[PDB]
Design a protein around this motif. Structure first.
Motif, PDB file in Angstrom:
ATOM      1  N   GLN A   1       3.892   2.092   6.318  1.00  0.00           N
ATOM      2  CA  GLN A   1       3.008   2.721   5.339  1.00  0.00           C
ATOM      3  C   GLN A   1       3.489   2.351   3.944  1.00  0.00           C
ATOM      4  N   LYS A   2       2.561   2.157   3.012  1.00  0.00           N
ATOM      5  CA  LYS A   2       2.960   1.908   1.633  1.00  0.00           C
ATOM      6  C   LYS A   2       2.863   3.196   0.817  1.00  0.00           C
ATOM      7  N   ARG A   3       3.924   3.994   0.878  1.00  0.00           N
ATOM      8  CA  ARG A   3       3.977   5.236   0.124  1.00  0.00           C
ATOM      9  C   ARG A   3       4.112   4.955  -1.366  1.00  0.00           C
ATOM     10  N   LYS A   4       3.092   5.336  -2.127  1.00  0.00           N
ATOM     11  CA  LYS A   4       3.125   5.185  -3.574  1.00  0.00           C
ATOM     12  C   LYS A   4       4.017   6.252  -4.191  1.00  0.00           C
ATOM     13  N   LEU A   5       4.035   6.313  -5.516  1.00  0.00           N
ATOM     14  CA  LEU A   5       4.887   7.272  -6.202  1.00  0.00           C
ATOM     15  C   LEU A   5       4.136   8.565  -6.497  1.00  0.00           C
ATOM     16  N   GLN A   6       4.077   9.442  -5.499  1.00  0.00           N
ATOM     17  CA  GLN A   6       3.413  10.731  -5.648  1.00  0.00           C
ATOM     18  C   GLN A   6       4.285  11.712  -6.419  1.00  0.00           C
ATOM     19  N   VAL A   7       3.744  12.898  -6.670  1.00  0.00           N
ATOM     20  CA  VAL A   7       4.469  13.940  -7.385  1.00  0.00           C
ATOM     21  C   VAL A   7       5.679  14.430  -6.594  1.00  0.00           C
TER      22      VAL A   7
ATOM     23  N   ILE B  76      -3.709  -8.649  -1.790  1.00  0.00           N
ATOM     24  CA  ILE B  76      -4.450  -7.475  -2.237  1.00  0.00           C
ATOM     25  C   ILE B  76      -4.036  -7.099  -3.658  1.00  0.00           C
ATOM     26  N   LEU B  77      -2.742  -7.224  -3.945  1.00  0.00           N
ATOM     27  CA  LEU B  77      -2.220  -6.984  -5.288  1.00  0.00           C
ATOM     28  C   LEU B  77      -2.897  -7.887  -6.315  1.00  0.00           C
ATOM     29  N   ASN B  78      -3.120  -9.140  -5.932  1.00  0.00           N
ATOM     30  CA  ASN B  78      -3.819 -10.089  -6.787  1.00  0.00           C
ATOM     31  C   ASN B  78      -5.304  -9.764  -6.875  1.00  0.00           C
ATOM     32  N   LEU B  79      -5.845  -9.207  -5.796  1.00  0.00           N
ATOM     33  CA  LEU B  79      -7.260  -8.864  -5.731  1.00  0.00           C
ATOM     34  C   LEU B  79      -7.579  -7.632  -6.570  1.00  0.00           C
ATOM     35  N   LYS B  80      -6.568  -6.812  -6.833  1.00  0.00           N
ATOM     36  CA  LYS B  80      -6.750  -5.640  -7.680  1.00  0.00           C
ATOM     37  C   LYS B  80      -6.957  -6.049  -9.134  1.00  0.00           C
ATOM     38  N   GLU B  81      -6.565  -7.278  -9.457  1.00  0.00           N
ATOM     39  CA  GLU B  81      -6.706  -7.801 -10.809  1.00  0.00           C
ATOM     40  C   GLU B  81      -8.063  -8.470 -11.007  1.00  0.00           C
ATOM     41  N   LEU B  82      -8.880  -8.467  -9.959  1.00  0.00           N
ATOM     42  CA  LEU B  82     -10.197  -9.097 -10.007  1.00  0.00           C
ATOM     43  C   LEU B  82     -11.181  -8.282 -10.837  1.00  0.00           C
ATOM     44  N   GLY B 146     -12.477   5.562 -13.297  1.00  0.00           N
ATOM     45  CA  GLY B 146     -11.060   5.876 -13.299  1.00  0.00           C
ATOM     46  C   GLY B 146     -10.271   5.209 -12.188  1.00  0.00           C
ATOM     47  N   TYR B 147      -9.251   5.907 -11.699  1.00  0.00           N
ATOM     48  CA  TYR B 147      -8.382   5.377 -10.655  1.00  0.00           C
ATOM     49  C   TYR B 147      -8.536   6.147  -9.346  1.00  0.00           C
ATOM     50  N   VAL B 148      -8.815   5.420  -8.267  1.00  0.00           N
ATOM     51  CA  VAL B 148      -8.948   6.022  -6.946  1.00  0.00           C
ATOM     52  C   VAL B 148      -8.049   5.313  -5.933  1.00  0.00           C
ATOM     53  N   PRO B 149      -7.035   6.027  -5.416  1.00  0.00           N
ATOM     54  CA  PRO B 149      -6.079   5.492  -4.438  1.00  0.00           C
ATOM     55  C   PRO B 149      -6.738   5.110  -3.114  1.00  0.00           C
ATOM     56  N   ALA B 150      -6.063   4.283  -2.321  1.00  0.00           N
ATOM     57  CA  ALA B 150      -6.597   3.846  -1.034  1.00  0.00           C
ATOM     58  C   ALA B 150      -6.676   5.002  -0.044  1.00  0.00           C
ATOM     59  N   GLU B 151      -5.789   5.980  -0.208  1.00  0.00           N
ATOM     60  CA  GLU B 151      -5.751   7.137   0.677  1.00  0.00           C
ATOM     61  C   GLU B 151      -6.922   8.080   0.408  1.00  0.00           C
TER      62      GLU B 151
ATOM     63  N   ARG G 113      -1.345  -0.126 -11.002  1.00  0.00           N
ATOM     64  CA  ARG G 113      -0.912  -1.473 -10.648  1.00  0.00           C
ATOM     65  C   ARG G 113       0.151  -1.445  -9.552  1.00  0.00           C
ATOM     66  N   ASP G 114       0.137  -0.369  -8.768  1.00  0.00           N
ATOM     67  CA  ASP G 114       0.962  -0.234  -7.570  1.00  0.00           C
ATOM     68  C   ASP G 114       2.456  -0.412  -7.812  1.00  0.00           C
ATOM     69  N   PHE G 115       2.917  -0.038  -8.999  1.00  0.00           N
ATOM     70  CA  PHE G 115       4.347   0.008  -9.254  1.00  0.00           C
ATOM     71  C   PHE G 115       4.923   1.189  -8.484  1.00  0.00           C
ATOM     72  N   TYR G 116       6.160   1.041  -8.016  1.00  0.00           N
ATOM     73  CA  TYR G 116       6.827   2.066  -7.216  1.00  0.00           C
ATOM     74  C   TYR G 116       6.032   2.383  -5.956  1.00  0.00           C
ATOM     75  N   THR G 117       5.702   1.341  -5.201  1.00  0.00           N
ATOM     76  CA  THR G 117       5.018   1.501  -3.926  1.00  0.00           C
ATOM     77  C   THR G 117       5.939   1.046  -2.802  1.00  0.00           C
ATOM     78  N   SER G 118       6.577   2.011  -2.151  1.00  0.00           N
ATOM     79  CA  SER G 118       7.584   1.721  -1.140  1.00  0.00           C
ATOM     80  C   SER G 118       6.980   1.586   0.250  1.00  0.00           C
TER      81      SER G 118
END
Lengths: 48, 226, 113, 97, 93, 56, 177, 222
Positions: A1-7, B76-82, B146-151, G113-118
């Motif tokens: 899983q790619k856990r982002k930086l949540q609170v 996908i990281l590169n595709l986010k810059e599209l 705005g910003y919407v996460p994949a989750e 920009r998905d910084f700090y994505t573990s």
């Protein structure tokens, strides 16, 4: 899983500043440079 | 002693960057106008971003494609810059396809041209291929705010499709300058200069007008007391 | 928000009339919050040039960048004219409106520090 | 600041205000031009920063700059652990997993 | 903090007596379903919903406000437990 | 399950925790105030949002 | 710079030469000897502590490479350096008490920009034992459960590679009496 | 979707204004500019200048009067004047008193289309043989203007007074986190407005959103 930086996640530099993600404030309500550049991370100066 | 209607200048450079001067304004109005517009600009300006990605022979985001340098993660990281510009306002979703092979560098140009769809940054390198390397993928770009996460949205066009973090907000950066101006009889008056850096999908002028309309609407919300 | 500004520009100069100190401040010879002996009393420019009737008015002026929250001024609180910063009476009214008792709040806190 | 100077932009009133608060703070040298004030200020690793929510410049300039902050193994989702009830152990009727 | 917690601590010789009073009163309020309240319709603790204002579900808050009214009488051995329960249950199902 | 969550449900939660409190406790407990009650307030994220005052 | 090559996280070149094949799974190089050396890139191998160990290439297809040169990044590595995290534009200031007692406030721009994505991999497992009433087996056939609940399970009871499972979802089947 | 606007005002001086909910970040986005406008640009009135018979400067105390001259000027800063005439820009009120008499704001000679909102405001006291003859000037302005800044005098020996133009005495807004549905970081904009009385808090707020809207209309012709 790619856990982002949540609170809450434990952040830290190399200089012993153990930190916890407070509130992931959107790009809007965050301190920003006169050129418009939005700050990435707000650190408590007290921790120094 | 009532200040009339100040002048409004426009100095744009292409589709990405725009300057918007307003002067003279009464003392305090520089940031009073400058900041909320900025906030709405960076936050609630509708735009477009890659919301889904499906690559053939790729079961998940953490897979890696044969003959392809970048893994599906970095791809996908590169595709986010599209940056995808929707010519038609009514249109809210476009599925771009991409088939490439051989020792070539896949870029945003290799996206199959869709009617009323314009890729703003064609030089965006998505993935590097190799002799025997085959990259076939369908990415879904939607319109949102705005910003919407994949989750959150979890958009999957098919089973092997992969939800992609959508940075809808077309605005990349907003500043505004308050300078000292005078009207001859009175001084210390504020002069606004709004600087807007956008990805190109929308014009700084357009985004500014949208922000203006949003703020105005939010003011309309203050009409009914209870 | 509750500490005075111990500015050095004033340097404790003696002034006969307060308007002379105001003039000196307008000339830029003397900072607003630097300790100053006007006549017999010792008082900074902010307490003479900026005399706020209402504690609300003081903050009203602060928000306009006229004065600061750390600028030692003259603000009238509970019918008593006080020498202190607008930020300090800001703190006083913080306590007051927090406890909804304007009297024992001003009696509670210590303002001069 | 070179881009701003090159475009034709003067100093922000908010910037000059922060330079006022900082001159009161005594970080920057007094009397110099706002560009030089901001020069010395930036030398201090501090910049004029605007509160995005207020817009009013954060009185007193603050230190900014890239820091190699890293995420640690002690992340939340592994640690989060809430429960109404829980299947009780067979060896002891206290709840376990 | 809780509204009138000061006056509540003042009413009792022991904060824990306040605890037992508020608690038992809340137990009465839930066992009877707030129909035994001494709070007037205007004094009923409200709560904001997406629909609108509704009665406060929490019985503890209710008991504390009821106690603030002073309309409640608390003390040791006021009435035999059996007769007390049977009377309160007679007035309210 | 996870997608079973809805506006109505979270509203009901907000209704029930209204007037109720949770005993927050830090490891290790050293004194009486090592645990303290707090009225639950729903917050985004997956981390306990603690009051800054009770930290000490 | 020394760490990554001494940690053997990132794979390097054993000789001067040209990279004939560049891929995420493997990097094959042609050396001056003429010999063809393949480097199988360890891709997202679960660490003992959970973090994913991945190796991303940095050399373009068919380009010159010297001896002791980087071919592909290691885990927590950028351009042949040690990258345990991501340097971010940090402003040191209190913010409404959100940064209180070492707490850290963060821009959502970092999440953008998905910084700090573990990438974290958890290892789950099922082991079967034989009992007289009935042994245990790893199968897709799991009693009292909908096919919609077994949507992301293959025939063998194994969760299909690439699926998205949640707490409550089934990973591996096992039945006994 | 649509945010409800609950208004709770107590008289002409105080008013609370809940706007809920607002998409994440919009709370301050509405609160701060409205705050700045409310404090700076709401059409108000104030005593800009003050003249007294035997008072040369602001600091020279008044004989036969317990009240300090500065104290009186302060009370005059508190003086709330309401112009019934929309075209009226300046009015010079006058005050004649003597003997032992606690002066009220109503003691000002009545001026047509001019209404003192708080007449019960204690301006000055007087003593046996004490005479108080003053003339205060009121102008229509906005925000706060220090005595030195406006620097206006109807006559010589007339004392310049810090202009408390803005009828809004204070604007304090708390952007508390409210929830709608799953979203819990929604911004409940609790805008609290303290006014002097000449302009009821709601009137001030509506004038603020009007001013802001009008300022938004400027992005039209380059």
């Amino acid at each position: 899983q790619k856990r982002k930086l949540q609170v809450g996640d434990k952040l830290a530099n190399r200089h012993g500043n153990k930190g916890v993600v407070a509130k992931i404030l959107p790009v809007e309500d965050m301190p920003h440079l006169p050129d418009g550049t939005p700050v990435d991370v707000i650190l408590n100066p007290l921790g120094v | 002693s009532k200040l009339k209607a100040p002048v409004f200048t426009v100095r744009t450079q292409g589709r990405e960057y725009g300057e918007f001067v307003l002067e003279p304004l009464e003392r305090g109005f520089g940031v009073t106008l400058g900041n909320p517009l900025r906030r709405i600009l960076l936050s609630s300006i509708p735009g477009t971003a890659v919301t889904s990605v499906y690559i053939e022979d790729v079961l998940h985001e953490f897979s890696t494609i044969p003959g392809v340098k970048e893994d599906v993660v970095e791809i996908i990281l590169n595709l986010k810059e599209l940056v995808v510009r929707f010519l038609n306002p009514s249109l809210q979703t476009v599925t771009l396809l991409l088939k490439a092979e051989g020792p070539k560098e896949v870029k945003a140009r290799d996206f199959l041209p869709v009617a009323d769809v314009e890729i703003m940054n064609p030089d965006l390198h998505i993935a590097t291929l190799e002799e025997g390397g085959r990259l076939n993928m369908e990415v879904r770009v939607d319109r949102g705010v705005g910003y919407v996460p994949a989750e959150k949205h979890g958009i999957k066009d098919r089973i092997n499709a992969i939800p992609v973090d959508a940075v809808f907000s077309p605005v990349r950066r907003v500043a505004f300058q308050v300078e000292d101006t005078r009207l001859g009889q009175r001084t210390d008056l504020d002069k606004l200069t709004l600087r807007i850096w956008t990805d190109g999908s929308v014009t700084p002028l357009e985004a500014l007008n949208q922000a203006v309309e949003i703020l105005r609407e939010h003011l309309t919300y203050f009409s009914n007391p209870q | 928000i509750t500490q005075v500004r111990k500015e050095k520009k004033g340097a404790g100069l003696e002034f006969a009339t307060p308007e002379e100190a105001l003039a000196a401040h307008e000339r830029g010879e003397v900072a607003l919050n630097a300790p100053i002996k006007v006549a017999g009393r010792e008082t900074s420019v902010g307490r003479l040039k900026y005399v706020f009737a209402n504690p609300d008015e003081a903050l009203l002026a602060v928000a306009h960048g006229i004065v600061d929250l750390q600028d030692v001024v003259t603000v009238r609180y509970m019918g008593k004219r006080l020498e202190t910063s607008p930020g300090r009476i800001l703190f006083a009214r913080i306590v007051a409106e927090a406890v909804e008792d304007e009297k024992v709040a001003w009696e509670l806190i210590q303002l001069d520090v | 600041f070179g881009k701003r100077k090159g475009e034709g932009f003067g100093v922000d009133k908010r910037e000059v205000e922060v330079l006022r608060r900082a001159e009161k703070l005594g970080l920057v040298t007094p009397g110099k031009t706002p560009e030089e004030q901001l020069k010395e200020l930036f030398l201090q690793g501090k910049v004029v920063l605007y509160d995005g929510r207020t817009g009013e410049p954060i009185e007193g300039p603050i230190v900014v700059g890239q820091m190699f902050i890293m995420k640690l193994y002690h992340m939340v989702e592994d640690k989060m652990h809430a429960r109404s009830t829980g299947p009780y152990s067979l060896i002891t009727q206290q709840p376990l997993g | 903090a809780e509204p009138g917690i000061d006056k509540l601590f003042g009413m009792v010789d022991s904060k824990y007596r306040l605890t037992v009073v508020v608690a038992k009163r809340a137990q009465q309020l839930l066992r009877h379903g707030f129909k035994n309240t001494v709070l007037e319709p205007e004094e009923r603790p409200k709560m904001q919903t997406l629909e609108g204002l509704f009665d406060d579900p929490n019985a503890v808050t209710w008991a504390m406000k009821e106690l603030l009214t002073g309309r409640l009488v608390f003390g040791e051995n006021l009435v035999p437990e059996d007769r007390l329960q049977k009377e309160m249950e007679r007035l309210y199902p | 399950r996870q997608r079973d969550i809805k506006d109505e449900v979270w509203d009901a939660l907000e209704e029930v925790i209204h007037g109720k409190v949770v005993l927050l406790n830090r490891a290790p407990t050293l004194h009486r105030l090592g645990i303290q009650a707090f009225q639950p307030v729903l917050v985004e994220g997956q981390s306990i949002q603690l009051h800054p005052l009770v930290c000490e | 710079e020394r760490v990554v090559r001494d940690s053997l996280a990132a794979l390097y070149a054993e000789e001067d030469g040209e990279v004939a094949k560049v891929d995420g799974n493997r990097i094959v190089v042609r050396y001056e000897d003429g010999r063809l050396v393949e480097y199988p890139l360890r891709r997202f191998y679960r660490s003992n502590q959970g973090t994913a160990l991945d190796q991303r290439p940095r050399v373009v297809v068919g380009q010159r490479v010297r001896k002791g040169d980087l071919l592909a990044d290691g885990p927590a590595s950028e351009n042949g350096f040690l990258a345990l995290g991501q340097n971010v534009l940090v402003a040191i200031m209190p913010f409404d008490g959100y940064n209180f007692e070492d707490a850290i406030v963060i821009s959502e721009e970092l999440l953008k920009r998905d910084f700090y994505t573990s990438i974290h991999i958890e290892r789950y497992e099922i082991e079967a034992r034989d009992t007289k009433l009935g042994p245990e087996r790893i199968t897709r056939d799991i009693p009292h459960l909908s096919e919609a609940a077994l949507r992301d399970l293959d025939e063998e009871g194994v969760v299909r590679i690439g699926a998205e499972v949640k707490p409550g979802d089934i990973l591996v089947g096992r039945t006994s009496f």
